[PDB]
């Protein structure tokens, strides 16, 4: 007595992501969850479902519904080498473009994600476009550990009922929030709303930023 499996089913995932690249599978996602045991396991089932929807909606936004493994515009790749860092860009100046479900970008984020995961992603950032197990964990790392431009982790925003809006702020707040790009804030809210509906939960408060 007591099925406490992942609050998103394979069927629900497939409905959320009809045009996903083969790189991205339900099994890959579920396999990664262990790395972040509080993710989608904290609070009431309403909240767990809401957090799962929040994560996956942002994922969908970053990747075009999991169509893209990596960032398309090669000419902009060198942008992501922050020369001010002391550990530099050893995998190459053009090696730190967006990859995986959260489109992890910048040498400094590869360094931090890698340090957190026990993987040298500064040295081998290509792992995030090659190895789904790593890719998924990079997404969960961002979600569960990083503030980005905001003041709290996406995980804590949902768990503490601070709002979906704060997850947006942590992912691309400096440009999108505070009137920067209301259309794109709304796009994320739309996808989140759809996902909460698929899962049978509510959006919660403070959706915008
Ligand atoms: Cl699948
Ligand atoms: Cl965790
Ligand atoms: Cl989307
Ligand atoms: Cl390629
Ligand atoms: Cl180089
Ligand atoms: Cl791994
Ligand atoms: Cl923008």
Domain ranges of the chain: 1-69+131-209, 70-130
Q: State the distance from the centre of ligand 3 to the C-alpha of 57, rounded, in angstroms.
A: 7
d(CA 124, CA 138): 13
Instruction: State the resolution, in angstroms.
Output: 2.0
Q: State the distance from the centre of ligand 4 to the C-alpha of 130, rounded, in angstroms.
A: 10
Q: State the distance from the centre of ligand 4 to the C-alpha of 129, rounded, in angstroms.
A: 9
Helix, strand or coil, per DSSP, at residue 70: strand
Phi and psi angles of residue 70, each rounded to the nearest 5 degrees, phi first: -140, 160
Q: What is the number of the ligand closest to the CA of 61?
A: 3
How far is Cα of residue 198 from the mean position of the Cα atoms in its chain? 19
Which residues does residue 99 pair with via DSSP β-bridges, in sequence order?
A: 70, 104
d(CA 147, CA 22): 30
> Tokens 């929807």 — which residue?
53
Domain 70-130, what fold? Endochitinase; domain 2 (3.30.20)
What experimental approach yielded this model? X-ray
Domain 1-69+131-209, what fold? Lysozyme (1.10.530)
Q: State the distance from the centre of ligand 4 to the C-alpha of 125, rounded, in angstroms.
A: 14
For residue 75, what is the DSSP state? G
Q: State the distance from the centre of ligand 3 to the C-alpha of 102, rounded, in angstroms.
A: 12
Residues 203/160, Cβ–Cβ less than 8 Å: no
Closest among 186, 191, 169, 167 to 178, alpha carbons compared: 169
Ramachandran quadrant class, 153 (left: phi over 0; alpha: psi -120 to 50; beta: rest): beta
d(CA 167, CA 9): 23
């Amino acid at each position: 007595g007591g099925n406490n499996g992942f609050v998103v089913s394979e069927a629900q995932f497939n409905q959320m992501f009809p045009n996903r690249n083969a790189f991205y599978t339900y099994k890959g996602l579920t396999d990664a969850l262990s790395a972040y045991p509080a993710f989608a396991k904290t609070g009431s089932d309403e909240v767990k479902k809401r957090e799962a929807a929040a994560f996956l909606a942002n994922v969908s936004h970053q990747t075009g519904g999991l169509f893209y493994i990596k960032e398309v515009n090669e000419a902009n790749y060198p942008h992501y080498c922050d020369t001010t860092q002391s550990y530099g860009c050893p995998a190459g100046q053009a090696a730190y473009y967006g990859r995986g479900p959260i489109q992890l970008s910048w040498n400094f984020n590869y360094k931090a994600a890698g340090d957190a995961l026990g993987i040298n992603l500064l040295a081998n950032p290509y792992l995030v476009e090659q190895d789904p197990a790593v890719a998924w964990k990079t997404g969960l790392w961002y979600w569960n550990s990083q503030n980005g431009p905001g003041t709290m982790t996406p995980h804590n925003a949902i768990v503490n009922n601070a709002g979906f809006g704060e997850t947006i702020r942590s992912i691309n707040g400096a440009l999108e929030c505070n009137g920067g790009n209301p259309a794109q804030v709304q796009s994320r809210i739309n996808k989140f709303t759809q996902f909460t509906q698929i899962l049978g939960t509510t959006t919660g408060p403070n959706l915008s930023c």
